[PDB]
Amino acid sequence: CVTQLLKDTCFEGGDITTVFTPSAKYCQVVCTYHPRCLLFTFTAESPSEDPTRWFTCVLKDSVTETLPRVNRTAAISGYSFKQCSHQISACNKDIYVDLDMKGINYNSSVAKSAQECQERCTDDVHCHFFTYATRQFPSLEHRNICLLKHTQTGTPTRITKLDKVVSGFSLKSCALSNLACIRDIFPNTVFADSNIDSVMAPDAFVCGRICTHHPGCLFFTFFSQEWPKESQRNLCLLKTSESGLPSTRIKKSKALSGFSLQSCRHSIPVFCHSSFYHDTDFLGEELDIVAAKSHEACQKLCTNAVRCQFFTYTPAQASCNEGKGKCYLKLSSNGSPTKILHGRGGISGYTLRLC
């Protein structure tokens, strides 16, 4: 697979969304972990482009898993690592000089060095990236200030070039900490704080692993398959709060809440969910309908199809049917089913692309 970047290359029409990363290599990393990104075109700083268009990192997707390559000045393009057998760490220990990475500034303190600012961002529950003013900054009001920042996506909204100031990334992803990701588990409890996203999960331990990898989730609430309201069954509510803790614990049955251990054991085990869910149909956008022998073959079909996020093998069972059954390869936007269905005789699972 391709890990080397394509210099002065611009991919054309796969735009999923556009986010701002320091470099093209980080643009790749963001692409790699995006549920749908296959390709990217990064716009490096050059006089041929207007400053606002700098550090543009465009996440792309294509049914054909590739896109037209046009040549263009100061454009670095490349491919995701979804298929690749080599791995990356997603940990940006680099500190970027003369770079203002912008987001929602929520903290503004003082720090001896950028490394003290970094350690603050790393240890702060909400911090995604930081910007630190060196001692030589024009404004004496701002000298030696540490701005803790967070964004919806975990990546900056806009990056500009500002002299005598350094930006960097939280190093929560650099920890090891084999320890339980779900940490505090609150059975027969619903939380009720800002819901920032929602996905459909088969069990409550997928729910937790998602919250741990989600940029802005600190605690969660999972409604089970036996939860009263059908629309809410298997609903994984990702929540956050200004404190970082829940506010109120409402004791309702058939719902399980919990706490993310943000830096636990979670580079790629939510991606290594090699579990098979029997009598379970992961709904989504249909990508193909291939035929195969086992669900273990269906899985290998989903892993090798780079656009496949999850699968449902509908087993044929040779009671009176053929031995070969149907392998629905599927996808969605979040990377999770749009609805989990119980009782329709399918064996479901998750792609092993990033495992």
């Binding site: 009263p228 309201k229 200004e242 409402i250």
Partner: peptide, 25 residues
Amino acid sequence: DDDWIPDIQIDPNGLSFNPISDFPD
């Protein structure tokens, strides 16, 4: 065990904060 009304309305949006200004040039 006595009554369940659906009074948890899933609502996706962000966490608020106190505004802090950027560096000027």
